[PDB]
Amino acid sequence: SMEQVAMELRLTELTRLLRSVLDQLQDKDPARIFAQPVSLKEVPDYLDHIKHPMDFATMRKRLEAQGYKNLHEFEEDFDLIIDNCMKYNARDTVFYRAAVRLRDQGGVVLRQARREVDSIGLE
Ligand SMILES: Cn1nc(C(F)(F)F)c(-c2ccccc2)c1N
């Protein structure tokens, strides 16, 4: 149907928006601390602590599969990346602090993303 092609155009343009957002976000992690899943080989008890791991590459595969229906779903995964990091690592540590910084940097990128989504009307 033509309505379905309409729906796909919107979802596609949401995806095109989220790609940009994600590309900006990973630029804010030049250490690439958050680029791949935390390694269970290197952190064997990680899953005893973190029930829902997330990382940028896992977000990008969902993105390109157009599995983000809206900006909220995308944000929730971003929050997992940040929050998981802040649970496992203590406040005085360089990991905890990177997540704080990425959360703050990221909040600006996401602030305008929420406005474009609303303005261009994609949900
Ligand atoms: C975002 N994040 N968080 C963690 C940690 F929670 F496991 F410390 C790690 C990690 C720490 C040591 C080895 C491998 C990965 C990363 N990359």
Side-chain angles (χ1 to χ4, degrees), residues 33-34 36 38-39 42-43 46 81 84-85 88-89 95:
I33 282 328
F34 305 105
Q36 296 289 337
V38 168
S39 179
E42 307 178 357
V43 196
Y46 194 64
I81 298 176
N84 290 342
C85 192
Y88 195 88
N89 308 110
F95 288 95

Side-chain angles (χ1 to χ4, degrees), residues 46-47 49-54 80-81 84:
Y46 194 64
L47 296 194
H49 296 262
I50 297 306
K51 285 317 158 190
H52 299 104
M54 191 45 67
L80 276 175
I81 298 176
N84 290 342

